[PDB]
Amino acid sequence: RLPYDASKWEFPRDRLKLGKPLGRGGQVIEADAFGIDKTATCRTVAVKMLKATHSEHRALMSELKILIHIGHHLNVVNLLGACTKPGGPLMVIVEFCKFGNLSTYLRSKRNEFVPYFLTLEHLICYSFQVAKGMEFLASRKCIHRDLAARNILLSEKNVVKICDFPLKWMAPETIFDRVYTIQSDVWSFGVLLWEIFSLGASPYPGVKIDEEFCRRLKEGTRMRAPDYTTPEMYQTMLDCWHGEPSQRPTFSELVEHLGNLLQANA
């Protein structure tokens, strides 16, 4: 039932030059787009394109309409355009983030980190930017449901973006009640913070994720502090992992709090 304003979003297929595959997101490729922001520039973009069942067409067209509905924020992966007219493949064009995902990136910097190279400023800043992106998504009345460092991408000038399009990340009430809400995303955000301050480690190191893990989780067991955390950042993880979803901070409160930690750090 959502509209598609072709005047606003439609981009000519002949001004898109196919480049290197990114993978399977729908095939996701790099492309060079001329004029996509109306200036006389060539820009690398990310394209999702259809290989074609009606179900798959519908899913991609629905993605397109949701990205439109959501709108623009610096800390999400934004829609730039689409190719929907008959006579070529259905394509959805979004911002390209040249450094890839945050988990793989931080792992690559394990020996290129000093607290004060990545520094604490960088990690708190990534953390702050994600919270701002999530605060935006919550205001558009979305729930993410896989908020994890692998779904954050790093673009130029340390801008991080949530891919807006996983038991170790799930809130206890989601595991046990099937419930996904914005407060359950706050729990995931705490896991993501741990991912950031472990420099891209896997959560719950060397823990079998089974009925006993879920038991200990309902009972109050939490991850220990990761190796590159500040005490304040671990406190924030614990806050996000409150057993009562209503006692977790909101994304707005995290943006305030992390903003203060970012400024205190400087």
Ligand SMILES: COc1ccc(S(=O)(=O)NCC2CC2)cc1Nc1ncc(-c2cccc(-c3cccnc3)c2)o1
């Ligand atoms: C060198 O750049 C990268 C290297 C690796 C990644 S990745 O680590 O996220 N793996 C991508 C694979 C396809 C799932 C991401 C990027 N950069 C990037 N920029 C944008 C996207 C991206 C990644 C997945 C899906 C979509 C997309 C594109 C269009 C419509 N909807 C979704 C875009 O990825």
